[PDB]
Amino acid sequence: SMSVKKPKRDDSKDLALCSMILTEMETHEDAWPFLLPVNLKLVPGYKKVIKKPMDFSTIREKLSSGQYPNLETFALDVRLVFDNCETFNEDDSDIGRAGHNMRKYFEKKWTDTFKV
Numbered sequence: 001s002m003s004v005k006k007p008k009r010d011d012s013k014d015l016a017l018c019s020m021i022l023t024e025m026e027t028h029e030d031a032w033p034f035l036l037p038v039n040l041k042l043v044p045g046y047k048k049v050i051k052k053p054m055d056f057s058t059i060r061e062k063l064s065s066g067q068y069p070n071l072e073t074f075a076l077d078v079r080l081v082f083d084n085c086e087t088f089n090e091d092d093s094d095i096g097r098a099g100h101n102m103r104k105y106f107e108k109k110w111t112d113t114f115k116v
C-alpha cells in the first residue's frame, strides 16, 4: 500500500528474455499455423467466432514497439494464440495438435525463465 512495497523483483531483463522465448516459439517446427494472422477473408467463421485474433508476428511487433507494459501482458497474448486455436480447431487435427504442442513448449520456457 502507500509507502509499503515488497522487495523489487528485477525486471530489467524481461524484454530480452521474452524476445528469446518468442524466437524459440517462431522457429519451432509446429509454429506454422501461428506465424501470421489468420486470413479473415479466406477462413470462413474466423472473424465472427474469434473475438481477439492473435499470432506470433503480431506479438513480435507489439514487443518490438513497447506495447507490452509487463511480462504478464506478453504471456496473456501468447496464451490467447493457443486458446483461439482450441476454440476453432478439433484436438484431433494437425493444427489442434500443433496448438497443444506449442502451449506446452511455451509454458515450460515460461516457468524455467521466470519461476525456477
Ligand SMILES: CC(=O)N1CCc2[nH]c3ccc(Cl)cc3c2C1
Residues within 6 Å of the ligand: 032, 033, 034, 038, 043, 084, 085, 088, 089, 095
Ligand atoms: C491457427 C488456425 O486456427 N488457423 C485457422 C485454420 C488454418 N489453416 C491454415 C493453413 C495454413 C496455415 Cl500457414 C495456417 C492455417 C490456419 C490458421
